[PDB]
Amino acid sequence: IAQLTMIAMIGIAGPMIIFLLAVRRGNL
Amino acid sequence: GWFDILDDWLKRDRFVFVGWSGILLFPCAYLALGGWLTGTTFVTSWYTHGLASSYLEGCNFLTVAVSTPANSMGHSLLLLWGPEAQGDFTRWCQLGGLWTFIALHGAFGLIGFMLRQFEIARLVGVRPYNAIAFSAPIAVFVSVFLIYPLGQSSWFFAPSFGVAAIFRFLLFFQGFHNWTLNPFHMMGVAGVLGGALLCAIHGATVENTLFQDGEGASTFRAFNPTQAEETYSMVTANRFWSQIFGIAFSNKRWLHFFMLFVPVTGLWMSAIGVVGLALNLRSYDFISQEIRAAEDPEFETFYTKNLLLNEGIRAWMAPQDQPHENFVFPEEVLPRGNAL
Amino acid sequence: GTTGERPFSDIITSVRYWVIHSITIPALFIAGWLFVSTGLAYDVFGTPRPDSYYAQEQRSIPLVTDRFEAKQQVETFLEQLK
Amino acid sequence: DQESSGFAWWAGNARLINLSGKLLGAHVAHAGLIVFWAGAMTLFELAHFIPEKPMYEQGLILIPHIATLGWGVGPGGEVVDTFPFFVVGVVHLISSAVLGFGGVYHAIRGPETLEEYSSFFGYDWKDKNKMTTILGFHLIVLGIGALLLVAKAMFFGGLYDTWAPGGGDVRVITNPTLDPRVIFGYLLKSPFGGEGWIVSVNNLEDVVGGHIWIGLICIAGGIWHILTTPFGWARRAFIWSGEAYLSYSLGALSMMGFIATCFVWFNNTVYPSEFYGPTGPEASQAQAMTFLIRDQKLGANVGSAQGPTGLGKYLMRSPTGEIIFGGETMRFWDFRGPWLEPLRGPNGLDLNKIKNDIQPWQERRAAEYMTHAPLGSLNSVGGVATEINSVNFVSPRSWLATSHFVLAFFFLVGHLWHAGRARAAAAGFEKGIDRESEPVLSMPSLD
Amino acid sequence: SANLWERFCNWVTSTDNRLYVGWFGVIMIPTLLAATICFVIAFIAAPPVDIDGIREPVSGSLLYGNNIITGAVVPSSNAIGLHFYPIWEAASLDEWLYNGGPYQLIIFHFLLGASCYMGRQWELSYRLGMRPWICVAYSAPLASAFAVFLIYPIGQGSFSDGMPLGISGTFNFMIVFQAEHNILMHPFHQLGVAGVFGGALFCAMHGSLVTSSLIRETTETESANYGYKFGQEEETYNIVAAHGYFGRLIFQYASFNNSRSLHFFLAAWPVVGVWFTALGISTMAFNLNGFNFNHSVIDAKGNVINTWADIINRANLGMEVMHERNAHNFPLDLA
Amino acid sequence: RIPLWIVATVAGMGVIVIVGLFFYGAYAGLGSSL
Amino acid sequence: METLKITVYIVVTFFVLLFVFGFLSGDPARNPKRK
Amino acid sequence: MTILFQLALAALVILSFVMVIGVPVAYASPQDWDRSKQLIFLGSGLWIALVLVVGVLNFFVV
Amino acid sequence: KLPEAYAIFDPLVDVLPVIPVLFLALAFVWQAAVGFR
Ligand code: CLA
Ligand code: CLA
Ligand code: CLA
Ligand code: CLA
Ligand code: CLA
Ligand SMILES: CC1=C(/C=C/C(C)=C/C=C/C(C)=C/C=C/C=C(C)/C=C/C=C(C)/C=C/C2=C(C)CCCC2(C)C)C(C)(C)CCC1
Ligand SMILES: CC1=C(\C=C/C(C)=C/C=C/C(C)=C/C=C/C=C(C)/C=C/C=C(C)/C=C/C2=C(C)CCCC2(C)C)C(C)(C)CCC1
């Protein structure tokens, strides 16, 4: 019905795995 | 004196330079752009062309448009408070008042804008060749969206503001005016097509004849924003083309003036052609051709072929393209080849 | 290379901006939405609703045929439940 | 390690031209994206796949690739078991994670260079031996692969043969054409109308057969390169650099991209009209068939029917005398196909077979293919640009052919671009003309 | 003799030739001379060509009743399709001129040479120590000729469907195309006109900006052009005054100040745009046409509410229904 | 202070979302054909 | 007519050879500097 | 068996999701990948078993 | 369709295909974060 739930997470996943790096500051 | 103070303020160097011109430019330019964006999503063309023309009705960015007024309106300026709309806004919309709105407003917006160029040039103390150039786009707008329909029965036959609504304007001119066969239109394309060549060719010629002024590969940073030496080898460029094409520039001042001339002259010619299409004084046929085609049934050129394509365009389109004529073309009168 | 205006970059980054615009931006949005969803837009622009192009039986178009008495003629077109 | 004092941001990946290690991560992470797609797409296709309905009417382009290899299908391209589809899809999808792992690893953890962390894997672009050798490895990997097909066809099940004697069906090829005169004959075939070059393959024996030759010839060259160095000319002819090598492979893909476009558009054999749609010529042929069939039932003598031009409404002659279908369809008289062949005689379409040997399965085949020609719009509205909305369809043959021409093209530009840079890089002026020593200024005036 | 062939190669490749006959040139120069010579003779004296393979010859040469605007070199017969039709494939020239033989001889030689012309546009750049890529700009106009003279015919199954070699003959190619593919409603074509319109626009932009910001070195009654000498060290215009004006016309950051970034854009725009237009004709050569919004918006009862998209369809039907009068025998146009 | 690169990638997806809603609307709205 | 075929073929072979044996002749060498 | 299958398969999804976001930030910030070289290893190893679980277990549900 | 069991994942598989594109995108998120070096 609304698998937009899926997209959303796997979508914010990409920027997350670099955001956490802006926090843990290192290797970008 | 207040004047010089009014001046002072206007000609102040802001982010978005206003200027005296701006008093004309910005009001119109915004209303023009606004009216389109308005009609594009909200106003319909039902009562005008029996057509859905806005997002609100289901049209997409391609099929949307601000359609011309009815043919009944004639060349009426269609003022919101004129005899037609009678101050009423909703009616105005349904009678295609938004067309003459966008048209006339945008028209002044182009006057203002050229004035701006003229005004800003003066201040900055540079030559107005940016203004001369911009005469070409004016001529086009003036001749096509004003002069043309002014020669026809009404605004209804002016190009409607929209993507698709412009494609039919093209197809129409082919079918009815055989516009592609017009000497002036040809010059037109020769200028735009040839102008889009100079653009490309000169750009590429420069980027690949550059001197090395840096140690990087991305030579973009290697540029001196503060003049001095030529950033590209004008002498090398000359020899290149002189050996691959046989002819080559050798006077950047001329090469650049040429780039102004070609596309501006082109658009001007294409305008004249349309100014003639207003009176229907088209370049439809070649008399010598028709006479031989009449007497001799085996004579066939790519020209004769085309005219038949026009016949089909006119016969099959006219009904829903010119509603005010209440056309009724029985299936048997409709020109058609075999099988198709 | 500069003028009085406060460098966009700073503003688009100022927490103040978002504290303002997180309210303002969606506000305008929900407004325009309602403009359509409440059917108001249809009346502001005389645009036909999906069930208002033709009368039930009629298949003719309400083409305005004369300038001066157009408005009057248009009104009559709405009459036949069009 | 690498930043603006390397290349510009938008040319970032060129900063990896000399970092073997990281440049491996890319290739291993990338190769994951391809596997990921293949897998994730197959499952997407199957998820929407409707068994009792043509594949070409469902926007499939992977499931029909599997079907061709004889998997999940039977008589006339009838779908029997959807498991092989699900398998191939999930397997890939998994391997994408494995590869993706390695990719990410080699590009952000592992050695940034290889040369030291193992001299076997590390490499030097100008190292003509390492290059010819790595190339030699890959020439073998590809060679085994070519045989991996020959195996599936001869031993593990077969392939879908539309030309099947009893009518299209999965058949085990146990007689590959190995005769070089025939095999390599194809390469000496014209690429124009009639003689169609490679795209003219019309039976699985040659396909399987030809692949045997390639598999061997390829591995043979794989060993030769392991055990050698480029000769003399081979060195004084080419440019030896990281870019130059790329370029060579770019033009190579380009060329294969064009060849692929024509294969999916023209070929009937390795691209079964049962899974994909009917070929361009096949559909236009089918129209002639359909109406020759119809009107003949209405009492018309097809053989002597005279059309408007006086050429032959239903049947006419080709430029070399053969009897072919009439109408604009005279341009596709080079079409051959299972459904239409039994009507062909030694002189082309036989007026007697056409007169009383037309079978029902052919009439509806012709009808089917006629109403499913590869004509459609971007927004997927099957038919002529003037058609009405209703039939949502665009032949897989149309999708494939267009996508791959665009790719093939841009790659030829890519080629030119990287080849032009390599030649300037080598000789050393890809960054501007030396202000001091300006070459042109030392040459006599031609004026 | 230092070695004949060694010398030969030194002459060919010589950068001291008035016209750089390159290595690519060795193929170019002959192929282009065949194409031109055959063309000129065809266009002037060639006899009628049965383009549609239906024995209905279309004369397109001057001596046979045509003028510059109508005249053209007619495409090979449809009976020939994609078959190779070299002079030595005809019982006689009479048969060869009737089946549109000249057309193939022309298109093949031209496309061949015009490709080498690109290859040359690299070679000379190499021999002169300048960066390549100029030839990559020329790859766009070439890729079009290819699309219009070879890709579309391959796709459509016949060379008779390629664009004719003439003014009016070209207009025919367009009008019919539109009918069968609805090109105006295709993204690639739109990008094409964007590149072309834009090109001409920018061409005027640059051209004007520069010429208008030239440093004075000329008299009031002396051509402003003389204020430049071939082989100058410094620039001939104030690119900082140029940027100053244009930056105020719109707004600063929406204006170029880097001549290199300017000229890249100047080249990039049209070439990229034309590249897509070429991919349009090459894509629609496989019947993947423009958007079909026919009878999209319909009312609450089911009635069809027309849009400008429909008015376009009528115009298209007219072309469809009237093109190639006697060539169709069946309902659907699948060729 | 909100890091620019986040302002973009958020305003970015936000556009792909609205423009994507439009594309969905093309197979459901009035602009449909059904 | 069968002759013309032969002649053309010869003629085209000539130029096509001149072309291959051309770039083969150490073409990278031919240029301003590094070679 | 069925729910048992849906557990392994669904968990295998969340592990991947976690694994996919994990491994990057891991090799990324060198604040360890020595203590996490332990976590990642367990994630990698576990995953494989899971796939094999869902693998063999598939033939019993479907 | 997807084998009876996996049906619960039908919605999931519906989005999987588009993922590759995201990577090409992500590379830009990164560069933006690292202030386009
Ligand atoms: C493009 C393929 C490729 C290549 C060329 C390399 C190359 C390398 N990797 Mg590696 N790697 C890859 C993919 C690849 N990897 C993938 C996909 C992963 C994820 C699983 C890894 C994970 C990985 C790790 C974790 C490490 C390396 C390391 C290394 C380096 C040391 C060599 C070594 O590991 O020996 C390994 C020993 C072998 C020679 C045996 C391999 C034999 C396997 C089991 C069979 C492969 C079967 C194959 C698919 C089919 C071919 C057969 C066919 C010809 C018939 C080396 C540069 C190491 C390194 O960083 O050191 C500097 C290291 O720690 N890699
Ligand atoms: C300054 C920029 C500007 C300009 C040049 C125009 C120009 C125009 N607008 Mg307009 N407009 C503007 C800004 C501007 N607008 C703005 C900002 C808005 C938003 C509020 C609008 C909203 C708007 C609407 C809603 C409409 C127009 C329309 C029009 C057109 C016809 C209007 C007309 O008849 O004017 C008449 C000209 C005058 C009033 C100028 C008089 C100046 C003299 C010197 C003053 C004398 C006054 C004195 C009492 C007279 C004494 C005489 C005595 C015998 C009685 C015209 C092209 C109409 C149109 O588009 O129809 C198709 C229309 O419906 N405009
Ligand atoms: C095919 C896609 C691709 C690939 C494989 C690479 C690969 C690479 N690029 Mg790159 N790049 C790409 C596209 C790609 N690029 C594009 C389109 C651009 C233009 C925007 C660039 C622009 C660019 C620049 C400007 C630079 C690189 C650099 C690099 C290299 C170092 C990686 C890095 O800096 O880590 C940085 C690490 C992070 C910030 C973490 C990123 C998140 C990871 C990598 C993704 C995880 C994938 C997935 C979600 C997790 C799977 C886990 C699962 C298996 C368990 C690396 C080899 C750099 C280089 O030159 O090397 C020194 C460099 O300077 N690239
Ligand atoms: C290139 C190979 C390829 C091919 C031939 C196909 C073919 C097909 N796909 Mg597909 N697909 C591909 C790759 C491919 N895909 C990839 C890589 C993905 C992952 C994103 C997908 C994801 C995907 C999905 C999710 C779906 C399909 C579907 C389909 C089918 C319907 C086609 C469709 O409706 O098109 C319509 C698409 C277009 C009109 C978009 C055209 C985009 C062009 C290429 C953009 C060009 C602009 C240019 C690049 C700008 C650059 C210029 C700038 C630099 C200046 C069709 C068989 C659908 C299906 O199966 O349903 C039946 C479906 O739902 N595909
Ligand atoms: C695709 C993988 C591959 C690659 C990249 C290479 C690459 C290379 N090989 Mg090679 N090779 C391969 C596979 C491969 N080989 C295989 C499978 C075999 C076994 C048959 C060989 C056998 C082989 C030998 C015996 C030799 C090489 C050599 C070479 C090197 C120089 C070749 C060269 O100068 O060509 C340029 C060739 C020309 C100047 C002739 C051009 C004329 C062509 C062939 C015809 C026109 C092409 C036409 C456009 C295509 C139409 C199709 C046609 C059939 C009608 C080069 C590094 C040479 C070398 O240096 O040894 C180390 C060498 O002696 N290879
Ligand atoms: C989940 C899951 C999975 C998978 C996963 C993966 C593998 C993922 C990936 C993912 C990804 C990989 C994602 C990404 C995303 C991205 C994004 C979302 C982006 C965005 C961007 C943007 C928005 C941009 C912006 C900008 C602009 C626009 C301008 C310029 C600047 C910038 C760049 C900033 C599996 C299968 C296991 C199973 C199921 C679950
Ligand atoms: C280097 C780099 C990069 C790149 C990266 C990449 C390219 C990566 C890749 C990656 C990858 C390549 C990944 C993959 C993944 C995968 C996965 C993770 C998988 C999963 C699977 C699963 C999960 C399974 C299964 C299933 C089934 C069987 C059915 C049901 C459903 C499911 C799905 C569950 C970038 C650009 C970013 C940036 C720069 C750096």
Ligand SMILES: [Cl-]
């Ligand atoms: Cl015609």
Ligand SMILES: [Fe+2]
């Ligand atoms: Fe310039």
